[PDB]
Symmetry: C3
Subunit: 455 residues, 3 copies
């Protein structure tokens, strides 16, 4: 049986944030959540997360995923572990202790760590990593066999010891029953540290091993925003790598921003500086061009989103959007819809093959198929208090620069004259014209400011 | 005499693409095309490209640049070379064999390789490179003199051999007559490999040399999208380096996207995240700001394109465009034209010094010089079936938010009243007003929803 | 007493620019200005900048910050120093000689250099740096004690010397009185070089030391645009690091463009590809999304700027702007103002809680609080010659797609009908309607082009 303890009871200062550190986001979810997902690879029978500062925010994020215990004050990693004792005391198994601020440790690394632990019959295994700049890290001193002898902190290190490149990531697997017996010994003999338990086990000459991360960047502990941006870069290359391996082309995967749960079908083409966030799905052969920003939306197959922002919406196959369009929450663009430059669609369903190419606002409308909106078309939905709905049937022709004042209905095949203000229904097959009549006055431009003579 | 054989008969799986691998683009042209351009540096008398999968797509891309031969099925690099035998058999000269999927090898490297080959009287020269991680590569085993003894594959390598850092890039120069005699020997004695020919030459103790690429990244073989994005990064730094050496300033040449044939005059200033594609030309002192996207367009000298998209158009000296404007195919912006924010110009010619600063669509128009378009101006060109042309003379003043319904003509110096719908011609020096007359109704706002009392 | 001499009398060719080299910008100010700011850390009693080519442009930039001297022609770094002799000759102190084209040397490095010089009682101290590729640099030859023996140029170097990794950055501290005596000796015995003075001091066996930069990139001399972009990258990481340490989150600090004097409060969140320029200030908890571009503007606390461009303006707490909006010079957005997509505000003050969500131009207006602008609203301010002002009171409702022709006044609580053209004042509490009346014609759509039957 595997257990997991997650330390998320962080008090520290360098984030300069009211938000507790582990809840700071990387690729769309909290650090603490990345860690929970790696922890899931060991299939723990119990996961206890230790909360402290702003416990309830943390508890909202992992609600129903983990048991919680609270450490009422800072007193070391030892005390933090000791808060889990009433849940874990005496159970037989292997317990991972991991911090909620090392969001880059992979599930695959944690499985390798638990496997090493079990296979070598360690009582403790320290997850280590190798760096050419170990300043500040506790060092792993091995004897020649090559068991861990001890962990030596910077401030207590000899000069030969300072040259050890193998350092303590602060992540461990312990035989569970022994972990708690040792902690109680340390507890009654005393701020205490989980590293103290390594001391106890060397005193009883129980076997302490060390499993070395192949990639040191995975060991990053995030204490400030500079490390958080480092984590972000690392995770971005990771997620974009997965996308590319699956058949997604990236002009620049080092500068394209795709959250952890975004899904992307093979043959997608993504230019640099594209942003996909939340529960976004992109269908096969879809092209996303530089500046495109999609939050919580489904885009179908064969679409082209050019430099446009799509929020909480659904977009069918073959749709073209942009450049410079805004699809705002609860819109649906049916198959082969064209939305052009400087068009906003808000809360509206747009039937298949319909076109709005320019300078148009469609707000709170239900629109049929094969509709044309001339440039400058405005739907008017909000009077200061009520929001009204417009219903536009199939094959309606809304002439350029007209104003459709809801609640109105445009019937199938109707037409609205360019420049009209529309305040009443237009039946199927009817036209409606609400505009003023051109009157020319010869020669009069001669007396106006723009005229070349008056210059 | 130099000859070149290009291997482009790729079957492989990791691209997950219907598009044959060598046709995947890097900086605006196919890998295979980058390779053809490096191959051109050796001035070959014959270039034979070996096609296989989807031969005709490949043949379209190199049409009239190379002879083609087809390998009907996968049977090794040896067989692929052997398909060129009826073209090259018996000719006297030095033959480069190169893959169409190594798009970063430079012309200058290939010239250095052919020079080394000729000067050292090699019968074969392997293009090699040095890496600290040679896993998976065939290794170059030299004796002390230091001729090539052999090429050792991973799966056949001794452990001392596994530590060789000199690896086979899979690019070679051969004495031509000997290449084909050796291949026929291997052929009749047998999937066969071009590497087998190195074996034959060591059997006859003919001289096999090795020319080492100074930059290992040049040796990249692209097998999947992760390598394709690597190639893209490498080529981007290359092209941007050339631009900078020639006098172009880059806020961030690591994140600016300029295709291989774009031309850029000295003194240009390019912010990060700009995109130039296709046959684009940018004149002296032109400023391009972050987000700008130019495809197949000529921009003159002293212009400022702020965050705007210009397609298949021509833009004269001194023009300012943006932010957030769209110049769509077949437009011309004359000298000192201003196009402002949220303006689309489509298929229109705009005479010198004309201004459209806001929220305007100019579609299918011929526009004179010194024209002003007030904000919200819409040209209406398409009725559902016909597309019409508008003709606007010099010094016309089109008032804000008016609607110009084509086919109409606005004569020199004419003026259109703000808010008008225009459906007939306006003569030179005339004004035209087609709008409704303001009627005020005192106190009535008191009974509407927006009014502070009704809140 | 410390003195500083800055060499800014650059003639060279590889910039391909009319602009003198040191005036080329990095993060919003000239190289020469970065250098002046590092020089300020030593608290010099005198700073003399040596100008040559286009002296007056240079003199404008440092006007009132430094004494100037002119070198009328290229004759070496020795001559350039010698131009400062009438200002500095005979004064007792330590003189830094530094080039105006090494914009990455830090104030902290220069203080460490002056401290080393004084503490070791050097007569000269060369600022050195260590690189694994020293080709082209003069090398520092030390004896074992380990004083500087000499500086050896590439073209005069022995082969053992060519392997020295310690190179001359071309920055020095000198005992001032000795500097000038030595230069005059070299002068009367002779193009001459500041390095010649090291020769003189070794002849008199005066103590020549060397202080080694910890970071070699700091030593970059900018001679062309490729190095200028390198400087830009280095400075960008520096400025963004400072921001992060202070509590600003960066999705990608390697691709976010913040000038040297921009100020940013803790808890700000900045997506990649954001641009802050000039004297911009960003308040606490403000969110800036990808594409945002702010020049010389103050943004208050709790605002959200989504993909929008703000120039020379002021923006209060809680304001939301974007996506795709343009705030142009001399605008003020009061508290909780919403500016939505495809809206331009130019030279206007917008009272608190006012909303313009779409497709609107507000030009030269004074706007009260709680105003609503329906989509498509256009203010008309310029007639070809005069620019007029519009005054819009509190709680005005300007209906969608209307045209407000200045000079007009909309009184408190007034309403303008959607689609209206407004040419006269609307009193407080009045409505104004200036639009044409809808007329429907049944069945007539049947004979138009869009109709499904006519397809
Ligand atoms: C040229 O494109 C248009 C022309 C046009 O009127 C000629 C109108 S209109 O809207 O003014 N009129 C419709 C129309 C279409 C084709 C041919 C003729 C017409 N109109 C002819 C004039 C009108 C006659 O009005 C009446 O019937 C009044 C009542 C009576 O006389 O009894 C209507 C049809 C609209 C457009 N196009 C667009 O608005 C869309 C542009 C785009 O998609 O970007
Ligand atoms: C203030 O800027 C404008 C004012 C204006 O009317 C006063 C008009 S207008 O278009 O309504 N009229 C033209 C005009 C210009 C200057 C001075 C006066 C006028 N108009 C005065 C009222 C009109 C009189 O109408 C008739 O002649 C009716 C026939 C008759 O009485 O016989 C026309 C000129 C346009 C603008 N400006 C813009 O549209 C462009 C804005 C931009 O570039 O962003
Ligand atoms: C539905 O939203 C609107 C409706 C509307 O008329 C019903 C008008 S209106 O501008 O045409 N009229 C104002 C109005 C509001 C609420 C309820 C009624 C009205 N109008 C009723 C019709 C009008 C009657 O006109 C006259 O009084 C003529 C004179 C007379 O009969 O004596 C005015 C009020 C405006 C809007 N909304 C917007 O423009 C803003 C949209 C946005 O913020 O994006």
């Amino acid at each position: 049986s595997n257990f997991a303890i997650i330390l998320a009871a962080g008090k520290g200062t360098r984030m300069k944030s009211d938000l507790p550190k582990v809840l700071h986001k990387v690729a769309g979810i909290s650090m603490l959540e990345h860690v929970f997902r790696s922890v899931g690879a060991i299939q723990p029978e119990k996961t206890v997360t230790v909360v402290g500062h702003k416990a309830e925010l943390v508890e909202e994020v992992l609600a129903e995923q983990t048991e919680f215990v609270t450490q009422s004050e800072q007193l070391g990693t030892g005390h933090a572990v000791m808060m889990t004792e009433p849940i874990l005391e005496g159970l037989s198994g292997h317990t991972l202790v991991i911090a909620g601020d090392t969001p880059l440790i992979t599930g695959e690394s944690l499985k390798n760590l638990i496997d090493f632990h079990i296979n070598h019959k360690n009582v403790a295994t320290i997850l280590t990593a190798e760096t050419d700049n170990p300043f500040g890290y506790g060092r792993i001193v091995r004897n020649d066999n090559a068991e861990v002898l001890r962990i030596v902190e910077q401030k207590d290190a000899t000069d030969f010891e300072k040259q050890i490149k193998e350092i303590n990531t602060g992540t461990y697997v312990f035989d569970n029953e022994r972990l708690f017996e040792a902690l109680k010994n340390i507890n009654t003999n005393n701020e205490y540290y989980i590293t103290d338990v390594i001391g106890i086990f060397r005193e009883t000459g129980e076997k302490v091993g060390a499993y070395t991360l192949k990639d040191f960047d995975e060991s990053l502990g995030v204490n400030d925003r500079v490390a958080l941006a480092t984590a972000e870069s690392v995770m971005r290359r990771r997620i974009n790598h997965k996308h590319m391996v699956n058949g997604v082309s990236f002009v620049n995967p080092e500068a394209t921003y795709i959250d952890i749960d975004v899904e992307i079908a093979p043959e997608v083409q993504i230019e640099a500086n594209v942003i996909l966030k939340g529960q976004t799905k992109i269908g096969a052969e879809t092209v996303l061009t530089n500046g495109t920003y999609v939050v919580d939306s489904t885009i179908g197959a064969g679409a082209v989103i050019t430099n446009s922002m799509i929020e909480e919406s659904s977009v069918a196959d073959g749709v073209t959007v942009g450049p410079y369009a805004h699809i705002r929450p609860n819109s649906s663009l049916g198959a082969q819809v064209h939305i052009g430059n400087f068009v906003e669609v808000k809360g509206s369903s747009i039937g298949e093959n319909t076109k709005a190419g320019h300078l148009t606002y469609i707000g709170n409308c239900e629109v049929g198929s094969n509709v044309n909106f001339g440039a400058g078309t405005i739907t008017v939905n909000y009077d200061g208090k009520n929001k009204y709905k417009t219903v536009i049937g199939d094959n309606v022709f809304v002439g350029s620069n007209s104003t459709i004042i809801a609640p109105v209905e445009l019937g199938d095949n109707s037409l609205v004259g360019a420049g009209s203000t529309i305040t009443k229904d237009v039946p199927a097959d009817a036209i409606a014209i609400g505009r003023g009549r051109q009157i020319n006055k010869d020669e009069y431009a001669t007396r106006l400011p723009h005229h070349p003579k008056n210059q």
